[PDB]
Ligand binder design. Structure first.
Ligand SMILES: [Mg+2]
Ligand SMILES: [Mg+2]
Ligand SMILES: [Mg+2]
Ligand SMILES: [Mg+2]
Ligand SMILES: [Mg+2]
Ligand SMILES: [Mg+2]
Ligand SMILES: [Mg+2]
Ligand SMILES: [Mg+2]
Ligand SMILES: [Mg+2]
Ligand SMILES: [Mg+2]
Ligand SMILES: [Mg+2]
Ligand SMILES: [Mg+2]
Ligand SMILES: [Mg+2]
Ligand SMILES: [Mg+2]
Ligand SMILES: [Mg+2]
Ligand SMILES: [Mg+2]
Ligand SMILES: [Mg+2]
Ligand SMILES: [Mg+2]
Ligand SMILES: [Mg+2]
Ligand SMILES: [Mg+2]
Ligand SMILES: [Mg+2]
Ligand SMILES: [Mg+2]
Ligand SMILES: [Mg+2]
Ligand SMILES: [Mg+2]
Ligand SMILES: [Mg+2]
Ligand SMILES: [Mg+2]
Ligand SMILES: [Mg+2]
Ligand SMILES: [Mg+2]
Ligand SMILES: [Mg+2]
Ligand SMILES: [Zn+2]
Ligand SMILES: [Zn+2]
Lengths: 92, 73, 167, 100, 53
RNA sequence: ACGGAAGGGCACCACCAGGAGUGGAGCCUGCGGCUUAAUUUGACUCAACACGGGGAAACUCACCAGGUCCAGACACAAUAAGGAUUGACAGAUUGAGAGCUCUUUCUUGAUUUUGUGGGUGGUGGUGCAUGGCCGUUCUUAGUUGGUGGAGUGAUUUGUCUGCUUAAUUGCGAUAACGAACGAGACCUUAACCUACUAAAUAGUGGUGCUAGCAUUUGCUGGUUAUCCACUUCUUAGAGGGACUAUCGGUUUCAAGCCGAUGGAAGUUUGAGGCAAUAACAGGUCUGUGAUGCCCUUAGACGUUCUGGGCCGCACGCGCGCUACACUGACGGAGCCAGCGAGUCUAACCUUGGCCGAGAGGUCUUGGUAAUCUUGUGAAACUCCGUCGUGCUGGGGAUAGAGCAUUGUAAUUAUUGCUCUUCAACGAGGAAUUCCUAGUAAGCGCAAGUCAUCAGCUUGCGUUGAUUACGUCCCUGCCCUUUGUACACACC
């Protein structure tokens, strides 16, 4: 999975303030819901993050409810070079 | 499943990898100190005067305007 | 803009999807059921479990993304859907809740005999008329077989099964 | 004004409560109402072979679910219609209010 | 590429699939539920269907 | 357990008495065989063979001939910004505007590429390694504790002589005290309520406006801003309604049926759902992101694309459809159902006008539905007709030609329409299946499959027979006694 960083980051920011992501297990639609990027981009990148202890995943009727973990946000914090204690993904 | 015979010839001919030449993007070299640029630029304003028009044989090809530039001079 | 026939069929679809979500993600939190209440300009979901503080998490962190996970997939505007977690009554009187309890205990190397006795007798003092626990599959050999555990009495046939029996 | 109420739940014993609760409110308010009219239970049938396979005796059992509809006509001013449309809410019970 | 997903599945069996298990054979299309006959069976209780008669 | 053992009792998946049939013809569809590159595959009596909701043009698709791509996450190592790598116009090559590969130079720059581990995926194997589910044993009445009495125990027992119920359904000696499950009770559905509870989303009567026959008071109609009144019929919620009630016979004369009465309802009132213990190495790994192990994993058994195939055809079977003519065929007329379905961010059901031989098309309208298609004006049907016992106007298999619609695309004709062509079949042998009142049998409609297509199924309504109420002859089923050299148990 090689793909432009303008898509790697784009799902990475959108995951930060939202805290979680959903994506249908529908390959080849080329338009994710609420993200202009491709569906295959969303599924594979988060699969990479899940392998590196950052994200946890469920299948849920081929819907792939993607949710972030504690070690995920710290990696995202340095990845996006955001200020410390900027905003959480599930803040009230 | 007995086997696969592959009656077609040995056709694993995976293409080149944009074969590694030496340093590239040569405009030209002169002394003290002027340097100008050959490989005439595309007339499309979308290219920021940096692209190189590939001219193979009697036709020149663009890289940023992926394929749309065709003029012979 | 939908027929009333299709609405209540799709209404039951919402519950079945929600039920299979809340049993796969909240498996270790003692999830024991869910029900959906519909209000004008507001939707409610009651997650009935045992470890409600674990379902919500610290500062309601765990419930917050669950509310927002259900928020995005099911196409709900912000503030339209919210999840309220309430501790289920009579924990022992739940076939669903005693189901994952029998699950992790089996995954932790507990013996089939003791794990099945533990569930059945526990439900007895919880006020149930009777309990049934079945363990099928490969036990002590390659030749699979079933082994049945029970106490009290259970009515097998009749309408009371729908009224009383939880399975 | 001619407001009309509609109830389309699947549980009569739960649904007859809401219809009873709304007719008594206007009656104790001294407003003329059109009594609760109960539509026939439209039946949604799904019939399938029980077996997941294709073998064995061809057993065909049906799963049925029933839809119970009620609708009531009222004539009430704007002040009291607002407080009655936001009450009498029950789980699994759908109500829609249309004016004229 | 333009040959990966070109052929249409806008109609026919390949168009529909189980919303629950992404199968093609043994499906219910009535009322717009789109659950196959094995999946519709196990969630018949949850969906609202029952064996009255 | 079994007996081509006995006894008692049942069953139209048994038989009688019988009804319709099937087998005999043509077709459609499944299986085998053959054939092929492949004709993907599971199931072989009941308990495989219109079954996999399997009515496959592409998709599904799993088989075949080729073409791509990689979805190899991640860790380490290696090449490496003197650049790791990605894509590309034109032509060759290719079914193919797959640079897929090749000639050529452009293009983006750390995501990548290569090797080792490790993953992922699979309608690949194993249903004899599995879960769950479904069928069968076995629609019959049967199954099991606890505490207690005979043994040297395995075991017995409860759980039956018996009368009789469909039912260890009921009931009374007597070494047992109660119970649990099953049946039943229960839920759904079917018919009665002129009594309770309401309705132009349903109706009825009357009054307004208005049409026709008559004109004389009547009859048949229409009318939404003309209202008025009501709920028998239609919808409903809670209910009432049957419990075998009343009476004569039968049996230590211990409780139903008969005989009759009553009633809407007296084969648990009819029919369904649910449906015990224990088993089958029954089917299923082709529903699943439900799975163990095995296989495979980059010219992959992963995915996708193009064209084929699953239909192919000497033959043997299965489930079926159309029939072999006046109880008829065909033509004009009369003309009656209930079960259901239906579009939204979509293009569903569509009345009405018009065009067309028809198919069908065209322009608006109505409908998220008791208001609209729908009274689904179904068909078998009843009246007038034509025909006339001729393989004939029975029968329409085969073919030939044209017009349409669905579908990107129909050629091994998707299906509909039009004309022509007109075969077997003259009631079908051994065999064999189902069936007891609205039941058989005949007749069609809706829905599920559906972009198109029923000869299938699941339901619904329509017309409505003959023969019993039986027995153990057959084939099965249940309980007791007896015999057993049987125990994967008579194959
Ligand atoms: Mg006979
Ligand atoms: Mg026949
Ligand atoms: Mg049988
Ligand atoms: Mg079929
Ligand atoms: Mg076809
Ligand atoms: Mg095909
Ligand atoms: Mg293909
Ligand atoms: Mg088996
Ligand atoms: Mg099994
Ligand atoms: Mg004893
Ligand atoms: Mg003793
Ligand atoms: Mg004992
Ligand atoms: Mg009038
Ligand atoms: Mg008497
Ligand atoms: Mg009954
Ligand atoms: Mg399975
Ligand atoms: Mg494959
Ligand atoms: Mg076949
Ligand atoms: Mg059959
Ligand atoms: Mg006629
Ligand atoms: Mg009707
Ligand atoms: Mg004819
Ligand atoms: Mg027979
Ligand atoms: Mg249909
Ligand atoms: Mg009989
Ligand atoms: Mg002897
Ligand atoms: Mg002897
Ligand atoms: Mg022996
Ligand atoms: Mg012998
Ligand atoms: Zn440009
Ligand atoms: Zn499914």
């Amino acid at each position: 999975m090689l793909m432009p960083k303008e898509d790697r980051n784009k799902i990475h920011q959108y995951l930060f303030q939202e805290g979680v992501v959903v994506a249908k297990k529908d390959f080849n639609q080329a338009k994710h819901e609420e993200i202009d990027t491709k569906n295959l981009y969303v599924i594979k990148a988060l699969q990479s993050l899940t392998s590196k202890g950052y994200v946890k995943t469920q299948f849920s009727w081929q819907y792939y409810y993607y949710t972030l973990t504690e070690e995920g946000v710290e990696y995202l914090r340095e990845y996006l070079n955001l200020p410390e204690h900027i905003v959480p993904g599930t803040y009230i | 499943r007995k086997k696969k015979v592959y009656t077609t010839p040995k056709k694993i001919k995976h293409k080149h990898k944009k074969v590694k030449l030496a340093v590239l993007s040569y405009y030209k070299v002169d002394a003290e100190g002027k340097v100008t640029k050959l490989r005439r630029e595309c007339s499309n304003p979308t290219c920021g005067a940096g692209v190189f028009l590939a001219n193979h044989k009697d036709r020149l090809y663009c890289g940023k305007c992926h394929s749309v530039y065709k003029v012979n001079a | 803009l939908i027929s009333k026939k299709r609405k209540l069929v799709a209404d039951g679809v919402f519950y079945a999807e929600l039920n299979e979500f809340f049993t796969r993600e909240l498996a270790e939190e003692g999830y024991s059921g869910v029900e959906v209440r519909v209000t004008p300009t507001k939707t409610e979901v009651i997650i009935r479990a045992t470890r409600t503080q674990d379902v919500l998490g610290e500062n309601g962190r765990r419930i917050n993304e669950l509310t927002l996970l259900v928020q995005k997939r099911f196409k709900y505007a912000p503030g339209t859907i919210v999840l309220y977690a309430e501790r289920v009554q009579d924990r022992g009187l739940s076939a669903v809740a005693q189901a994952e309890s029998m699950k992790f205990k089996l995954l932790n190397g507990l013996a089939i005999r003791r794990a099945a006795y533990g569930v059945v007798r526990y439900v007895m003092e919880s006020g149930a008329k009777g309990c049934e626990v079945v363990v099928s599959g490969k036990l002590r050999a390659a030749r699979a077989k079933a082994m049945k555990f029970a106490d009290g009495f259970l009515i097998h046939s009749g309408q009371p099964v729908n009224d009383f029996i939880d399975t | 004004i001619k407001i009309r109420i509609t109830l389309t739940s699947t549980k009569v014993k739960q649904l007859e409560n809401v219809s009873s609760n709304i007719v008594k409110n206007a009656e104790q308010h001294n407003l003329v109402k059109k009594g609760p009219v109960r539509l026939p239970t439209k039946v949604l049938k799904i019939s399938t072979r029980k077996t997941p396979n294709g073998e064995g005796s061809k057993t065909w059992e049906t799963y049925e679910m029933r839809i119970h509809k009620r609708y009531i006509d009222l004539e009430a001013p704007v002040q009291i219609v607002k407080r009655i449309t936001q009450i009498t809410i029950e789980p699994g019970v759908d109500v829609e209010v249309v004016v004229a | 590429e333009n040959v990966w997903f070109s052929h249409p599945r806008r109609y026919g069996k390949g168009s529909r699939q189980c919303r629950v298990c992404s199968s093609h054979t043994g499906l219910i299309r009535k009322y717009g539920l789109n659950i196959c006959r094995q999946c519709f069976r196990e969630k018949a209780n949850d969906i609202g269907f029952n064996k009255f008669r």
